[PDB]
DNA sequence: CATGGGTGCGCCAGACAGGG
DNA sequence: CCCTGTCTGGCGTCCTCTCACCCCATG
């Protein structure tokens, strides 16, 4: 009886590395329920058990708060302080009450919540020290196939679900199989699985290199980037700071054996292992392998990379379905485009041709003049714009004045076309002129714009026929706004 | 469990082993408990509501015998009054003085003071026994009783129940015209007459010609024709007619017929009872009809003439549903209908699954027992007589017998499975045993 | 008191051609033969027409 | 049906009264009503004007007794410390 | 439902139906396999002889689907062996 | 406790569910019988009228048994062997089983008479359609001889009804009662009085040429027509009906 | 306390005597 | 042994619903 308590306290806190504090506050939270539950009422319940005896008394609670919504469960902090001035705000006031018989009822509450308990302890002090494990490849049995997740049973009352996204399109697994997968996120979810697996993300391929290489597992080759199309094929992107080890060599092993092993975990995923570079350029080349690339050209400003490869390697580069491109794009993080060393030359002589006739039309030079600024590598009015006069005073033929004037003259080709603009749509212009009248929203002076409408003038010229089209323009607001440009331009 | 056996630390008592249970009641009867009686054995401490019913049974026998003694004295006192009218009469005196003292008054040695002796002889004898009866009746409400070995207190409640009429009672008349009433209808779809009133109960006619119960027929015209007077003498009362219509009505409804036995008259009825025997009669006349010596078909028809109905006994009848005539005019009448008491809610019952019996595997036999109809051989043979093979089988090995079989089927029932795993009869192993206790060897090969 | 149970054509089953079934529910323990009874004798006579 | 519809056409300012009520309608127990009676809190909205502080100063209530008599406001949406602008009305400074 | 006389008239031992009828309704029920006649909330006695009444199920076509779908889970576990 | 939601749930198990209805001395193989439950507000087990004859059974205070089939393979024993409509034909010879017993043959035979007057006699008639509707307005008797034209099917093709249309001189009740008879029976099953004998054989015709399913929908039609016109029938008893013979005290 | 010992049914049918 | 009379055994409808009462006796 009494020393029971002790001798199942001891059990507990011993197998399951409890705080006994912590048992015991979540049986007083259990026996308080179980005895809210015998009375018709809704009362609050306190109950304290002794920690020597294991005896309990059980109270009519009386939470003390400032203002009473529950005059069943609370009381003022006046009248609590008439019974006990010793108490505050958040105490709780007694009542002697009979403490509920423990029959098998209050003892399966008590199992219930203790289990309860130890999930959020014992369960929970489990994950905290299989930290590696969270993130790491954990091992699971097959509990349960539905067709939209994949329930594991990992042990030690654990659950974790795979998602129909999180797997590889061609596995197909059975209750009572052994599956591995990364475990990627921890949710504290009140309902549902909380342990998250992964066996289709890039970081299930790291971790199986990881385990695979001991060189990487001992920090001597670092995985730099990992592109995946799960179930078919792979990229990864290695380095190393030690000049002795080939690090392509390490990650392939003898005769392939330890890329073979992560590739028949993968369901017979190909793996390809590329060299990691600090040079964007050369890691391009090393992640478009097995295709030869002829040359590269490298647009920074639009971060992408022109890739030109020989005609016979075309179809080797871009790979079935654009696989082997849209691998190394995201392996890069660069957009890349693949196409001949004949189309290449076609797709530059395209843009000096454009880059010329846009120089000649809005800068007012001569082709040859044109030529040179595409030569010496000017592309668009805007470099021509804004670039240091140092640079442009390095092209041969180029003075102080010339370069002034140039520079002029872009910053007004480029204020003519935004002013063209602004009046096409609603930018500047017709965001001004044609919005003056009261109520013209921008998305109306847009419209009004497309029209030829472009200014307060032109809308006071217009009859409320000429607008009826406008989609969101009624007679009545037509015929307000164009009285209300007429007033401003004709009697302004 | 641990917390079970933890009850003695958190709470108290000892520990939760033998089962705390309350002997509760069962269903099936409505009632309102209107009498409870409660018998101790001597010697066992009676509580607080036999000790109730012990001063309620002493307050009631007290107050009765006292009542005895109050009703038999006044009694007394008025034979004592009534003595005293002559002979020495006092008008005035006789009030002043306390009652009980009425023999000491003037009044020589006659037979009226002689019987005033006599009259104290039996109120003191009537003191005395009213004493010594009250000793024995406390007595007999103070005392035990002896009972069956080895029982504390007896206590029997007596339930009430009022059980009115629904389809599935049995009436009957007096002729054998039984039946089970069917449907309850309304009023309205009631066939009624061209007055407006309802008939009560509607019968069938095909069950006289071949049940060769005729009497029924007569029994139904004789009861119109009394109804019919009835009728006429509570229209000649409801119109407030003094006694002469009445008297008129009621000398020429008791004469009517033959050479009879009756011959009453009103004139020695002086206008009182005339009243009164109306105010009795005004819900139909009783009409007595002796058994082999009766009321022959022209006194029936000679007594539908007196009232205003028609001779041959049929009134046309409306429809109720239709509202449009029945052709051919019916016969109505009143018929004396008996309530019998096979009622409907003590033969029905019903099983799902309730306790068997001990001996042999199968459920228990009656209603009170909670039992399940016996699916006799008869039914066996009529079973095997189909094709019904199946039914069989689970009519006599799932359902009845096959402990295990049983129990895997409530399983596969409250699953949704429909099926049956077979097993054997256990009372065939019954068999088994009682033939293999004899020198008999019965065996089941291979 | 005056609250009744307000019925309605639950269904129009029209079976084939020139020849309808039309089904109401609910009504009272005895409105049905009521109803029926007065639409049966209206249609039958009372309903006007040509021949 | 339109004809026998047609047949049948010739037949067919102390706040409000809760607070202008006596402090005995709030059904207290005989404790309460006599404690509040000893501090001349004869109506309701003389009870919604005092706050639950200076209830615990009158002699003889209890945490239990001011329990229930936030029970029995709150039941009638009213609460403690409510001001109520010109309480008590001039038809209740006659009694 | 009221009659089963097609269903003999199609079936003609009347205790055959049964049979073909209960392995018919095992399968619908507990096998969750979809009635091949469109219901309206029968219960799978009355699914089992109607579809008996269209002639899509008997003994015959039962027997076939059977050792087809018997021969379709052998098959897919000799090609996910092999 | 029986809440409200229980009932729902028991309008869902008895549906398609038969059970096994036993009348208590089962001498021959029509003593058990499966029906579908009706549920009734009531304690009394409603029996179909034409079944009693079957079981033996009237209504005097008799009592029967129910007996659930658990399993699936009794319940398509029950619905396929032991139904009620199953057992129309006595299994000891040829004989209906099925037979209407006593009101409804009352019933019948006081529509399918005659008399030599009543109201609408000898007029014609354009259908059994209009024959119902002059006796439900009121305008001619339920036995009143008239010509009427009938449209008989006969079937003496190889499974072909042939349709034949003639007028027949028979009365009204005929007509109304030819207006539930199915197709391939002929106008002269109805033409005459039609009694219990003749009434078995109707129905033992009906069974012989259009086979099991009119046959169970025409019993059903016959009681029907039989308990609602001996309802309209006023079909009393007297003690006038019983005509004592004015011969009878010559000859004792 | 524990144990210890009526005389109103009638037919069929085959086995056991009983003459024969 | 071949027929005759006697002597014992084996058997006689199915479901239900109440009730009442189950071994003395005693040194
Ligand atoms: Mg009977």
Known sequence: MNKEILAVVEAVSNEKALPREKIFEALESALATATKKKYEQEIDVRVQIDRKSGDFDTFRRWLVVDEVTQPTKEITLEAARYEDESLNLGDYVEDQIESVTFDRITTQTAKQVIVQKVREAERAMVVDQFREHEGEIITGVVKKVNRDNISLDLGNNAEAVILREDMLPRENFRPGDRVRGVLYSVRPEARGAQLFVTRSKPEMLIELFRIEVPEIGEEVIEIKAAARDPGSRAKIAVKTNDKRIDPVGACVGMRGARVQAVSTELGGERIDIVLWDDNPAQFVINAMAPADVASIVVDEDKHTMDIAVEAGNLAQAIGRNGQNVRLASQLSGWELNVMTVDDLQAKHQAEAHAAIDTFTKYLDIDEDFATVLVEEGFSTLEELAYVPMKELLEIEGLDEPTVEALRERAKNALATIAQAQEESLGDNKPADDLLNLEGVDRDLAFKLAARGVCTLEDLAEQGIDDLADIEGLTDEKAGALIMAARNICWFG | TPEEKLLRAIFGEKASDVKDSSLRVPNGVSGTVIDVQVFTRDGVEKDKRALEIEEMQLKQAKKDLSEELQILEAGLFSRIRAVLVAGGVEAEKLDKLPRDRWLELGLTDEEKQNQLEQLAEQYDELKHEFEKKLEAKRRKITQGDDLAPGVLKIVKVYLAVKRRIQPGDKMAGRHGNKGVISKINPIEDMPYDENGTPVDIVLNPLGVPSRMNIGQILETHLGMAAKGIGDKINAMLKQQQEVAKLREFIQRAYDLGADVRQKVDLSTFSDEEVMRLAENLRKGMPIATPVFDGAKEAEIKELLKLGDLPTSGQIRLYDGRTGEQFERPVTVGYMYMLKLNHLVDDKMHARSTGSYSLVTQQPLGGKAQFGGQRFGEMEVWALEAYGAAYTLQEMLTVKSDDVNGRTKMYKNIVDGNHQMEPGMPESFNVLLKEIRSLGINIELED | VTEFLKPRLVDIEQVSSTHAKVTLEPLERGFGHTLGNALRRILLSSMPGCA | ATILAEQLEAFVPEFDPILLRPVDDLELTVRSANCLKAEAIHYIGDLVQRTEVELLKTPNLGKKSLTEIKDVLASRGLSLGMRLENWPPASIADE | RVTVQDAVEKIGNRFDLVLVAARRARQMQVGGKDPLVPEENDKTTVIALREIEEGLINNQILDVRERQEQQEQEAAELQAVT | ?252
């Open chain 6, 1 to 252: 406790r029986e809440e409200a939601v229980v009932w729902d749930i028991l309008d869902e198990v008895i549906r398609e569910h038969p059970v096994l209805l036993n009348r208590a001395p089962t001498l021959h193989r029509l003593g058990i019988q499966a029906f579908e439950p009706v549920l009734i507000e009531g304690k009394a087990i409603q029996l179909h009228p034409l079944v009693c004859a079957a079981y033996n059974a009237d209504f005097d205070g008799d009592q029967m048994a129910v007996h659930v089939p658990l399993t699936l393979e009794a319940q398509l024993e029950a619905r396929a062997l032991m139904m009620s409509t199953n057992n129309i034909l006595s299994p000891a010879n040829g004989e209906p089983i099925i037979v209407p017993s006593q009101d409804v043959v009352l019933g019948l035979y006081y529509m399918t008479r005659d008399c030599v007057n009543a109201k609408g006699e000898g007029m014609v008639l354009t259908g059994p359609k209009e024959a119902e509707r002059l006796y439900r307005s009121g305008l001619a008797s339920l036995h009143a001889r008239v010509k009427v034209r009938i449209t008989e099917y006969e079937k003496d093709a190889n499974g072909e009804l042939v349709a034949k249309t003639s007028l027949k001189d028979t009365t009204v009740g005929r007509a109304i009662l030819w207006m539930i008879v199915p197709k391939g029976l002929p106008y002269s099953i109805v033409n005459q009085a039609l009694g219990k004998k003749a009434i078995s054989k109707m129905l033992n015709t009906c069974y012989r040429i259009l086979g099991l399913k009119p046959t169970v929908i025409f019993a059903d039609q016959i009681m029907y027509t039989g308990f609602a016109y001996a309802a309209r029938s006023g079909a009393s008893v007297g003690i006038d009906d019983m005509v004592i013979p004015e011969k009878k005290h010559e000859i004792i």
